[PDB]
Amino acid sequence: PLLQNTVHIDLSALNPELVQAVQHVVIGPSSLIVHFNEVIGRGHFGCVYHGTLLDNDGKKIHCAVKSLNRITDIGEVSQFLTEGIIMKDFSHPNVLSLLGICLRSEGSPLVVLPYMKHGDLRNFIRNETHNPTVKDLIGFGLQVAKGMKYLASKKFVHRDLAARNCMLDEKFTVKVADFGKLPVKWMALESLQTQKFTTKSDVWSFGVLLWELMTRGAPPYPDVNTFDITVYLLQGRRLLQPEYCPDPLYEVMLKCWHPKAEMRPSFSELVSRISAIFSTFIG
């Protein structure tokens, strides 16, 4: 019999430009070991495993390897690879990048990502044994802002910026990412009403993310049900200042939630202002 393991992908059925872009980042099968018995996370769509990649020296590099589960049509493969390839264009320390793509003779293509020792940011900050300092939390927010300043300069709109979508590596470098209907409590008022997303709606979301950092990963608007959020915002109501949050940082959050998209600060101005806050907060 022909099993789920024996699937063969017809690359001639993909856009040739996608295949050629993938060519730029191909990882030979003999250079990758996937620890199929060490699942990092598993969804209905895909699964992520621990892996080891051998560099051109022959040294071992810990990585994360993303696969599709059961593949039944070419559009799922196309989507999967197109996502991976968007990351190829990113090169910034606060933006998640791709190590490469492996595709064997049979089976799912494999997207190979750097290993992020401390997982997602929201879980990290909620952990009592990590108990980050207020200073550390501001620092994380500045790193996110720097990654978003980069993305915005490339005209990439994130659409789901939130602490759950940022990851943390062994050097405590924050990498903006997207784990992949609507994240209503992170969305700008105009996006709730029109379902259009811009860099200025990412700024709103970043303000929410900052609030999550400073509350050590509290859920936003816990009292408000997700159908109630638009009314709350229409009345001019906003997330309240977290305990221990410096005043100038809360001022930054409020500015991010200005009802007029064009009066919100740019990521460049957020980087400057948060840098200033970080530099003067001694702790």
Ligand SMILES: Cc1ccc(C(=O)Nc2ccc(Oc3cc4cnn(C)c4cc3-c3cn[nH]c3)c(F)c2)c(=O)n1-c1ccc(F)cc1
């Ligand atoms: C553009 C684009 C396309 C695709 C992605 C994407 O596929 N990201 C993605 C993210 C996490 C993933 O999962 C893990 C990876 C690692 C690594 N180490 N460790 C420990 C992990 C644990 C998990 C884990 C999964 N579940 N539970 C735990 C994962 F497989 C794929 C992405 O992020 N972007 C993007 C969007 C906007 C940006 F700014 C930059 C990139």
